[PDB]
């Protein structure tokens, strides 16, 4: 224990040894973005219960949503048409992902299972391809790497990589001490960061299987995590009403995103196409747009009538989708 | 709006038809939580109503009940208990014979868990059916090592009424009730107790929807 406390002091000493100035000194000369004025271009209304997850497709037109009425809906966001409606075998679903090929969607929740659905069947329907059962928690998040690998987080304090063809865990990512709540893949899919209910975020090597770096600094449960488009930073929302920006090469917390009129939790975070904006959905039914370099709140999204549970920016950056507990998706632009 | 776009819109409208019909069919059910503490009588109650979440269905008087058992979830409740916010009622299970058994004490843990789920901000207007289990076992084990302030008689009736009043003293809300009952793990119809309590809950919800309750 003495050696571990010495190592903690050594890591803290080196972190202070690399930390002469902060982003408020470097990004002080830069001009702001003003007010951001977005409006609801679309409203996707087909769900009959709380919406827990959504995920955009990489063509920036199709998107899944999940809700507790037991349905996955594939949406056409330009025409507001619904392309599919997938009936779920368990309605207690907390996450959903779209495959970057377009051929598959995943979902899971309190069943402890990640079910995978083929959207491209000769029979003309959507059927369950696989069901991935190795977790003992509840499925918190899942993201496809490709058509055969998916990384899942769960509330048994672990993460896992899966071979979809065999249905078996390839590697398991242990080291958190609380329920893992979110994950985000690096834009080359060789690393991912996960945030858990122990106020810390961890950088994981996908091929090897061991934690590279650990990022403490929040005060409560980390609920959301998203990667920076460069791949050398990530943002992190939590229950202490604060988003924080971290840093991979500096191994350091860079900036907090807080305000005195914000006391609720942060359900979901996302970056824009370049950086410069951090979009975060909150429990107070709203969504707040931040300036990523200057910590100035650049605008609000006053839409939904219950808490904004999920949000996502398109792959080309043309729009933002937010879903919420009042059963509606809204496209903002 | 071309030929293939009219047919995609017709397909979308057919999907919407099926979604509304599934919602009408799903609104007829009665959803219920089961939230007891460990070895408390939850398995006995789901036996009388016949790793993830377990759902048991039963039919009684042309109504369909859905009881959800979340005991296989050994995680933090604070991250999934909001999934059951619009449930109709909660069934809580307490072993009356656990007043003297230690794991601390077994029934003080039940008081802690009942106060936790009763004063939750997601179950402010959700009422509770409280089953006090192990009635005969308490009848032959029978209090002042669990409640030393009790200073009263040592008979079954008054002790059981004391535990019930001490358990219902943690409500602190006008819009909800606790419908208590005692079960000796061989009672013939505890589905009737749930049916009567759910009837009272729906009458109170409908009167509260008119400005009358």
């Amino acid at each position, epitope marked *: 224990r003495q050696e571990a406390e010495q190592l903690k002091n050594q890591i803290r000493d080196a972190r202070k040894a690399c930390a002469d100035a902060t982003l408020s000194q470097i990004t002080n000369n830069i001009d702001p973005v003003g007010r951001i004025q977005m409006r609801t271009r679309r409203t996707l209304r087909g769900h009959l219960a709380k919406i827990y997850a959504m995920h955009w497709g990489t063509d920036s*037109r*199709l998107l899944v949503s999940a809700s507790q009425d037991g349905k996955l809906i594939i949406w*056409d966001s330009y*025409t507001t*048409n619904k*392309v*599919h409606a997938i009936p779920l075998r368990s309605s207690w679903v907390m996450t959903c992902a779209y495959a970057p090929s377009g051929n598959y969607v995943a979902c899971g929740g309190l069943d402890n299972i990640c079910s995978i659905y083929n959207l491209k069947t*000769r*029979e*003309g*329907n959507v059927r369950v391809s696989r069901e991935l059962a190795g977790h003992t928690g509840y499925l918190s998040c899942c993201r496809f790497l490709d058509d055969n690998q998916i990384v899942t987080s769960s509330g048994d304090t672990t993460c896992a990589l899966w071979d979809i063809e065999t249905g078996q865990q390839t590697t398991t990512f242990t080291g958190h001490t609380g329920d893992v709540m979110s994950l985000s893949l690096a834009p080359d899919t060789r690393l991912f960061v996960s945030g858990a209910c122990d106020a810390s975020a961890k950088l994981w090597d996908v091929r090897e299987g061991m934690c590279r770096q650990t990022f403490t600094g929040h005060e409560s449960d980390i609920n959301a995590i998203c990667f920076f488009p460069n791949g050398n930073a990530f943002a992190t929302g939590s229950d202490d009403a604060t988003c924080r920006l971290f840093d991979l090469r500096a191994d350091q917390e860079l900036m907090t995103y807080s305000h005195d009129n914000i006391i609720c939790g942060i359900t979901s975070v996302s970056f824009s196409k370049s950086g410069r904006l951090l979009l975060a959905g909150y429990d107070d039914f709203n969504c707040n747009v931040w300036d990523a370099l200057k910590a100035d709140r650049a605008g609000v999204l006053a839409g939904h009538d219950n808490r904004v549970s999920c949000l996502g920016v398109t792959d080309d950056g043309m729009a933002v989708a937010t879903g919420s507990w009042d059963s509606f998706l809204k496209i903002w632009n | 709006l*071309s*030929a*293939e*776009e*009219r*047919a*995609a819109l*017709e*397909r979308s409208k*057919a999907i919407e038809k099926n979604l509304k019909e599934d919602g009408i069919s799903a609104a007829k059910d009665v959803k219920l939580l089961l939230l007891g503490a460990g070895e408390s009588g939850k398995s006995t109650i789901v036996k009388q109503m016949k790793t993830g979440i377990v759902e048991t269905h039963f039919t009684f008087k042309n109504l369909h009940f859905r009881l959800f058992d979340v005991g296989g979830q050994r995680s933090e409740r604070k991250k999934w208990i909001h999934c059951f916010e619009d449930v109709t009622a909660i069934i809580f299970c307490v072993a009356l014979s656990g007043y003297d058994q230690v794991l601390t004490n077994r029934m003080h843990e039940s008081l802690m868990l009942f106060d936790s789920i009763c004063n939750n901000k997601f179950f402010i207007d959700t009422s509770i059916i409280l089953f006090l289990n192990k009635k005969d076992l308490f009848g032959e084990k029978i209090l002042t090592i669990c409640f030393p302030e009790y200073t009263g008689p040592n008979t079954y009736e008054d002790a059981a009424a004391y535990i019930q009043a001490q358990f219902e003293s943690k409500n602190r809300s006008p819009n909800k009730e606790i419908y208590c009952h005692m079960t000796c793990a061989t009672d013939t119809n505890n589905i009737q107790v749930v049916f009567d309590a759910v009837t009272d809950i729906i009458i109170a919800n409908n009167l509260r929807g008119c400005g009358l309750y």
Partner: single-chain antibody, 233 residues
Framework: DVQLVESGGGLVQPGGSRKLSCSASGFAFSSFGMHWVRQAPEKGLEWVAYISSGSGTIYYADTVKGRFTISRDDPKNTLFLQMTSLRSEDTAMYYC??????????????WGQGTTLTVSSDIVMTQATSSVPVTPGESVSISCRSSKSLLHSNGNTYLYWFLQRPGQSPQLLIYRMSNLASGVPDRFSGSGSGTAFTLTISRLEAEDVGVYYCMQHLEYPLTFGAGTKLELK
């Protein structure tokens, strides 16, 4: 896999009646719209009728209007074509075609085998010439000119290519002018802009031999080209 088996085609005296029946198996019949496409014994595919997925939209041709009636029974997985007043202009091989419509789908992607029946403004699609000889290994450009521009305002150009192997049903190659159907090599490719269109084969094998058809799907009625056969010089 998926099958569509037509039944009910025999000799009928002129002015009579006959009912065709297509029996489906191996897919979700109720989610697909259904088509009848006939082929006269000389040459050429042409469209007859369309019933939608929930049997709520029905279209006919002008030489079909009044006399024919399309219907489907979803628990039986069958498609019907009640035909009355059978004239000499109705002797054809009749095909039932399955077709689904959402964002990004493949209409007209599986055709049945057929039944020979015997007795006794529209967008004009042109293919010139009707027969080009190819050699096994050399490329070929098969063109198709339309009268009305098939480029819609949404960005889709609704033009489909079909290949009928000699003796078989025709099968989908290209859908919406530039895609590639499932189970088709990348030797085939589609190109064009608005009114002129081209199918290009690269490194032609001698199993691509047959007749090539271009179909418009911009407006109803659906119109085919006259055809273009390749051969074995």
């Amino acid at each position: 896999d998926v099958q569509l088996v037509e039944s009910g085609g025999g000799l009928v005296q002129p002015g009579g009646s006959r009912k065709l029946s297509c029996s489906a198996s191996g897919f979700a019949f109720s989610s697909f719209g259904m088509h009848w496409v006939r082929q006269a014994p000389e040459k050429g595919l042409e469209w007859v009728a369309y019933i939608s997925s929930g049997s709520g939209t029905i279209y006919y041709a002008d030489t079909v209007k009044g006399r024919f009636t399309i219907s489907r029974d979803d628990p039986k997985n069958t498609l019907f074509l009640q035909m009355t007043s059978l004239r000499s202009e109705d002797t054809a091989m009749y095909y039932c075609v399955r077709s689904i419509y959402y964002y990004g789908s493949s209409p007209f992607d599986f055709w049945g085998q057929g039944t020979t029946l015997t007795v006794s403004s529209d967008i004009v699609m042109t293919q010139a010439t009707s027969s080009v000889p190819v050699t096994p290994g050399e490329s070929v450009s098969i063109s198709c000119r339309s009268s009305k521009s098939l480029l819609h305002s949404n960005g889709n150009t609704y033009l489909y290519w079909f290949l009928q192997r000699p003796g078989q049903s025709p099968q989908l190659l290209i859908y919406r002018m530039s895609n590639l159907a499932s189970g088709v090599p990348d030797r085939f490719s589609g190109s064009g802009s608005g009114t002129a269109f081209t199918l290009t084969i690269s490194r032609l094998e001698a199993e691509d031999v047959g007749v090539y058809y271009c179909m418009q799907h911009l407006e109803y009625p659906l119109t085919f080209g006259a055809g273009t056969k390749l051969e074995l010089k």
